[PDB]
């Protein structure tokens, strides 16, 4: 059976947004296939604001997260394999989920 991570990621994303929170995603910068601006990497991780206002054309698919975002004014397209998504939480209070490891992502 396929991984549950993408389904849980979408559930929390919607819950966060619906409850007036700003969804932030924590990404494993070292995971294979991660495609984000280098200046975003800090301590081997990346933190991104996934709200509708901070992003454009956001897609939360089963295998990856993809969207446009602006960095110091520069529009860039990001691609994040689902296996690299470590957690999603509210910027306002840190409420969210830390995804459980899943064999397939290894």
């Amino acid at each position: 059976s396929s991984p549950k991570r993408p389904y849980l990621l979408r559930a929390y994303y919607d819950w966060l947004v619906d409850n007036s929170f700003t969804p932030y995603l924590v990404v494993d910068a070292t995971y294979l296939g991660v495609n984000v601006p280098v200046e975003c990497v800090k301590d081997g991780q990346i933190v991104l604001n996934l709200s509708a206002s901070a992003t454009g054309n956001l897609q939360l698919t089963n295998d990856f997260i993809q969207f446009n975002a602006r960095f110091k004014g520069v529009s860039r397209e990001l691609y994040i394999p689902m296996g690299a998504a470590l957690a999603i939480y509210a910027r306002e209070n840190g409420d969210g989920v830390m995804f459980e490891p899943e064999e397939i992502y290894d």
């Binding site: 932030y24 206002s53 992003t55 454009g56 602006r70 960095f71 529009s75």
Partner: peptide, 8 residues
Amino acid sequence: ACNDENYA
């Protein structure tokens, strides 16, 4: 977060 608060 790494990205600007406003995309548009």
